[PDB]
Amino acid sequence: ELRTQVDQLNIDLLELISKRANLVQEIGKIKGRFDPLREREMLNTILAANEGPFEDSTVQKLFKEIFKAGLELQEEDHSKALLVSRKNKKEDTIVTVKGLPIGNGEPVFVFGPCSVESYEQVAAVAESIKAKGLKLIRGGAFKPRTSPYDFQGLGLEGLKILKRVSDEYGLGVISEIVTPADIEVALDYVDVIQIGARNMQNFELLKAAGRVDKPILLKRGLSATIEEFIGAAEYIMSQGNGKIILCERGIRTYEKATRNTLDISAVPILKKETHLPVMVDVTHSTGRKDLLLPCAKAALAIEADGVMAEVHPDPAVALSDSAQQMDIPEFEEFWNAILASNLVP
Amino acid sequence: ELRTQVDQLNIDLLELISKRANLVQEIGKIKGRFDPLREREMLNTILAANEGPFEDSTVQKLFKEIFKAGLELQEEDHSKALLVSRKNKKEDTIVTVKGLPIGNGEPVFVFGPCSVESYEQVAAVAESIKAKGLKLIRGGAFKPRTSPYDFQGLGLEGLKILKRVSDEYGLGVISEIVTPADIEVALDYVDVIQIGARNMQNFELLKAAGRVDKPILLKRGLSATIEEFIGAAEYIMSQGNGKIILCERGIRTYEKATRNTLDISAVPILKKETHLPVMVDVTHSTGRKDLLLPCAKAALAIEADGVMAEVHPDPAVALSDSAQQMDIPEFEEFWNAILASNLVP
Amino acid sequence: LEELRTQVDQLNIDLLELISKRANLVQEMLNTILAANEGPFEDSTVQKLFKEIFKAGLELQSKALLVSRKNKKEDTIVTVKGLPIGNGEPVFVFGPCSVESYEQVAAVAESIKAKGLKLIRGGAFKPRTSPYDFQGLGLEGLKILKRVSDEYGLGVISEIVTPADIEVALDYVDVIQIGARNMQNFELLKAAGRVDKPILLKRGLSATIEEFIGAAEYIMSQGNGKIILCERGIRTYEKATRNTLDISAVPILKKETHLPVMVDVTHSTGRKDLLLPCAKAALAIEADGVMAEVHPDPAVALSDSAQQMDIPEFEEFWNAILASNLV
Amino acid sequence: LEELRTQVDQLNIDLLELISKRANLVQEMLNTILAANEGPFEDSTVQKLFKEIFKAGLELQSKALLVSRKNKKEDTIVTVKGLPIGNGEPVFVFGPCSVESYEQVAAVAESIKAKGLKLIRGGAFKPRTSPYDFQGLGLEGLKILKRVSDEYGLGVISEIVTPADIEVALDYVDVIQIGARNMQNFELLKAAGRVDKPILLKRGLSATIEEFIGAAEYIMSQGNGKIILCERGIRTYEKATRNTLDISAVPILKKETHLPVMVDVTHSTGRKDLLLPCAKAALAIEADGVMAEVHPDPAVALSDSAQQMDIPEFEEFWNAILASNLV
Ligand SMILES: [Mn+2]
Ligand SMILES: [Mn+2]
Ligand SMILES: [Mn+2]
Ligand SMILES: [Mn+2]
């Protein structure tokens, strides 16, 4: 009887909360952000006025939540509908690379050596890729290594090699860039800039990639949560570049039977939450040659936008992932199985 | 020149190591095991005779390895070729349940409620399963719960309900048994005894299941390694029962977007290492209704021997997994998608 | 600006008064609120704000777990062989991983008694990853432990692995241990909860704090409140150690529950070289006890051969504890 | 039995003599050995045994990492603002999570100086999960920190997030911090290795010990050996804490490397109620220092609002450290 009226005190709060929120954004316009001093000044006034029944600490918590809500109204704050989210843009993003519309429903395959070692080595792989009618190649010029004494990659010379081979065999180049200063130079040699797992939270590198007009392949961090992975993509897109391809490549767990644990569920999670295409790297996730094909099949069936695997003409002598890379005859058998699976329309 | 002869000291060691190994097994026959006292007595004699160049600690380590190797020669020790391994038996194990040869290459599907709540509730699910031409049903009479105050299951009465419904609708029953004393009673009510994730290393329960003639569905532990999972299956098979179906159901990781992380790579790993069929539980791994179908598709494409998912006539009122279980119309849509996928031959 | 700011400040006061008045009165409903939402916030934000407002109401306005301090504020003290575990003075539990023979266990017992210590741990039933590794002597092992207990005056802690063995164990042990792999063997927990005997409950390989507390509740809900919790490391990606000792579990559990908390330094780290440092950390963080393994001839042990301290190593370890002034 | 046993015993001696003689001589090859295998062991076992025999040979028969004790046995001491970090006396580093203003940082500095402490930590560049959360004041923040350092006489520790900023930072900080998320930002590590300035390297979110050591090696391989390692918790399934403080990392790193090792108790646990207990554990396990956050008004802080101690809380925390006798 009396608690029917407490129902209208709710309509009064909504009106009050909404009106206040509008005024605060007006103050933002008249001026031009975080202001802890103003927040404390507001809290002092509110708490001084508290006559109960709530204790000061409870009142402070409630108002903080109200203030926090206001931040999302800011033009530049997309916390409530991330630019990379379907909440922001419902339609799938198509990232076109060498005429291939990545994300359009037809899966793409990216093969290539772990590390660029020589012109002849990359050419041998490009020849086998072209022979299958494929159009992309991946190759590491800059290699993130656990130890500084392991092969770091050929650097710029590796990118030059990749460009030479690609220009001749008609392939698009995907290669990793490891520091902000190298992004500008990379534009003349690659078709897609890869940001590696270990750099997924190298924020200045993400921002740098967000300021150029070039597709970015962002690999999930070794132990990144889906939220963090989406957040990293937002760093790129918030600078202007929306041409982002996400890549699942396994996460770190207690399991020793595999190098990492392929998190296949990330594909449908990311395709639901974001509008960005999602690929799966079957080589670096499992770290096992005998699992490349089964994992590739799982990836395609779960509707990944693409699959990446490593191929090297003589894996025995490779400067990285010697036991994981497929040789040319193995690559032929792998591809014949993919062709026979009917998983690619 | 002189190190060509050190090559023949190798042939002498093999002969000596082999002859010794044979004598020790003869001692085992003449007698009838672990004997730390004899090991120390042997080590005292060996170390007393050490004139170098190795230090006593190094000599002790080498002989321990030699002694350790001898253990595998014991008849009852299968450490080097586990009974569940392909090294022991190359051919796939087929586990026949209600006329279905699980493991023969044709995937099977197991649907049913998380918990058995009443005759009518289970019957409603059995009716939808039978309508699709399916032949198995799963239902929890004993429910392992984090809190003792959550619904523990109906117990024996739940098994009686399952039997009644199954006998009428022609379905085979899969249900979890949680303690050794309950295995004997279960034989009259179930077609497959399930050992849950939390009991994967309840060894006395495994041994008890190994002493009866009834198919066992062994779920992988929350954080079990593949080695531990295979070891658990060996506890069952070492007692005589080789009718074991392995079930991947996700592993515990830092990720919060899912309840557990489905480890899809476990399927091809287990199918390579062992001769046992392997199923995937898509409900308990992801803990998310929107991921059941994608995960089921991945499971089938990676050649799992079966898929398990939960169905409840009114999930809102369910006593467990209320948000994860599919209702009857959802189950129809799920099944129609499976039928349309061509992933089941 | 001053103008708009003073209006915002007045609106702030209006909200306080409006919120508190409503609270006084209140002292399903979101459906009608959202219907009146006309911006600038989206429905989800509006809803999140009112839920915080309703939650506040439960400030000054019986389902506590039995093992929680909410249920019982005072510390639980479990007295074993005369030692009041949980009273503020840490206890030390040493002993071999596996019971292998009477002579072996007696050698460790002698060394324990020599230090004025009163407890011994020894495994008669050993859970093993592989069925082909030593499984324990079983009942014979319990009988050995009871003989040693009668002879050396030490209280025995030993693992029980199945519900039926709980009743059998009562005649042989002073504390029943439930191993990490059985932390969610719920029928075993209920069996342990039905007897009048202290239980040492080890955290599961990957058990959360909530799950560990829940497991203890299974035991106490059957009637047995003499429960000692044991942190023994958690499973992680790190390979330098067997498990990752989670030292933070001690103060967390001491705050949330009234149960004593011990730390097993051998099974957590799996490294002899880390036993002393981890024992010092456990004592400093106020654990109620430390457990470590000691064997007269570790090289030939049937379990944890590289992790167990021999008798001379045990003497050095103990002398270091006495010199640390951490007790 | 006696008969067969004495033969086995003689065969044992024959192996010792045969093995040692071969070793004396030795002082690809498995291919020929297996060819002669005729049982009872399978080839895999035979091969595993000879590999152990060949390995032994490398007993009494230059590629050590620069950061390893194998390279340099003596402890590295890093002196900052007159304090010799790593000399056996633990140091304490307090300060706010983010630099928000001069007045804010100065308030904490005053409290630090009042205790006779000499270091302060403050983030001018803040790595954040979301690009919409406060990113730090940047260069302005470094300038504030240097002003406070000149005024209160404290050495400044602050995070640098990109290679270009390493050189800029030299004029403002006494120690450059490399954050957990950048532990494998290899170009940043190399940049830090090319300057003459102490570096505080935080363990990555899920970095292994090996990886952490490797990261330190990137720095030292460029010439800079003034590296302080910082354990700050590792990512696990546990939700009761932000991260799992891995206390075992301290003695492991102190044994493997010659570099000092600190523990950040705020970022590991993410819980104000665990700061003191974890600091006591870190001191007892012999960490070279402890780091914790202090803010004059945590409720309004732009990062870690619930984790930072206010000034009165900092006083209680410090008084407890002084009363513990753990220093
Ligand atoms: Mn690679
Ligand atoms: Mn369920
Ligand atoms: Mn042990
Ligand atoms: Mn902080």
* Method for structure elucidation: X-ray
> B130 and B56 share a domain?
no
> B207 and B315 share a domain?
yes
Count of other CB atoms within 10 angstroms of residue D83: 19
What residues have CB less than 8 Å from A1, skipping those under 6 apart? none
Q: Which ligand is nearest to the CA of D294?
A: 4
Please tell me the distance between residue A299's alpha carbon and the centre of ligand 2 in angstroms: 26
Q: Are the C-beta atoms of B255 and B227 separated by less than 8 Å?
A: no
Q: Give dist(CA C192, CA C178) in Å, integer.
A: 9
- Dihedral sign (CA D90, D96, D102, D108): negative
Q: Give dist(CA C182, CA C201) in Å, integer.
A: 9
Q: Are the C-beta atoms of B186 and B155 separated by less than 8 Å?
A: no
Residue that is written with structure tokens 């103008």 in the block: C3
Residues with a beta carbon under 5 angstroms from ion ligand 2: B 114, 310, 321
> B89 and B76 share a domain?
no
> A110 and A241 share a domain?
yes
Domain boundary among D62, D94, D114: D62
Mutate to test the interface with D, among A38, A43, A198, A200 (most CBs of D within 10 A): A198
Q: Show which subunits contact A, needing at least 3 CB pairs below 8 angstroms.
A: B, C, D
Cβ neighbours of B2 in D, within 8 Å: 25
- Dihedral sign (CA B47, B48, B54, B56): positive
Q: Give dist(CA B210, CA B84) in Å, integer.
A: 12
> C53 and C77 share a domain?
no
Whether C278 and chain D come into contact, CB under 8 Å, resolves to yes
Helices marked H in A211-277:
226-237, 266-273
Q: Give dist(CA A135, CA A122) in Å, integer.
A: 14
Strand ranges for A119-275 from DSSP E: 136-138, 172-176, 192-195, 216-219, 244-248
Region for D325 from its dihedrals, namely left if φ exceeds 0, alpha if ψ lies in -120 to 50, beta otherwise? left
Residue that is written with structure tokens 């239980």 in the block: C199
> B325 and B242 share a domain?
yes
Nearest to C66 by CA among C229, C208, C288, C224: C224
Residue C212 CA: distances (Å) to CA of B52, C111, C290: 53, 33, 18
Q: Give dist(CA A259, CA A248) in Å, integer.
A: 14
> D34 and D135 share a domain?
no
Whether B8 and chain D come into contact, CB under 8 Å, resolves to no
State the smallest CA–CA distance between residue D269 and chain A in angstroms.
18
- Number of domains composing chain D: 2
> D179 and D220 share a domain?
yes
> D255 and D115 share a domain?
yes
B203/C161 touch (CB, cutoff 8 Å), yes or no: yes
Strand ranges for C64-160 from DSSP E: 78-80, 83-85, 91-95, 119-121, 155-159
Question: Residue C12: which domain range?
Answer: 1-62
Q: Are the C-beta atoms of A25 and A76 separated by less than 8 Å?
A: no
Q: Give dist(CA B305, CA B92) in Å, integer.
A: 11
Which residues, in sequence order, are bridge partners of residue C157?
Answer: C121, C175
What residues have CB less than 8 Å from B271, skipping those under 6 apart? B278, B303
Which residues, in sequence order, are bridge partners of residue A136?
Answer: A172
Domain boundary among B34, B58, B82: B82
> B174 and B69 share a domain?
no
Q: Give dist(CA C65, CA D118) in Å, integer.
A: 46
What residues have CB less than 8 Å from C146, skipping those under 6 apart? C156, C171, C172, C173
Q: Give dist(CA C204, CA A147) in Å, integer.
A: 35
Nearest CB to B201 within list C181, C187, C210: C181
Domain boundary among C39, C62, C85: C62
Please tell me the distance between residue C242's alpha carbon and the centre of ligand 3 in angstroms: 12
CATH number at residue B76: 1.20.59.10
C-alpha atoms less than 13 angstroms from C-alpha of A81 in its C-beta half-sphere: 13
Residue that is written with structure tokens 């199923």 in the block: B279
Q: Give dist(CA A193, CA A236) in Å, integer.
A: 12
At position A344, the amino acid (one-letter code) is: V
Q: Give dist(CA B78, CA B91) in Å, integer.
A: 18
According to DSSP, residue C262 is labeled: E
Binding site residue list of A for Mn(2+): 114, 284, 310, 321
Binding-face residues of C in 210-229 toward D, CB within 8 A:
210
Q: Give dist(CA D118, CA D109) in Å, integer.
A: 9
Residue B301 token pair? 């494409």
Mutate to test the interface with D, among C243, C245, C248 (most CBs of D within 10 A): C248
Count of other CB atoms within 10 angstroms of residue D122: 29
The torsion defined by the Cα of B110, B112, B113 and B117, in degrees rounded to 10, comes to: -130
Please tell me the distance between residue D97's alpha carbon and the centre of ligand 4 in angstroms: 4
Whether B12 and chain D come into contact, CB under 8 Å, resolves to yes
Which residues, in sequence order, are bridge partners of residue A175?
Answer: A193
Residue that is written with structure tokens 């403080």 in the block: D245
At position A74, the amino acid (one-letter code) is: Q
Nearest to C299 by CA among C311, C291, C310: C310
Helices marked H in chain D:
2-26, 30-35, 43-56, 102-114, 139-152, 163-169, 186-193, 209-220, 249-256, 265-269, 275-284, 311-324
> C171 and C290 share a domain?
yes
CATH number at residue D158: 3.20.20.70
How many helices, marked H, and strands, marked E, lie in chain A? 12, 10
Nearest to D167 by CA among D199, D136, D192: D192
Q: Give dist(CA A33, CA A75) in Å, integer.
A: 11
> C196 and C276 share a domain?
yes
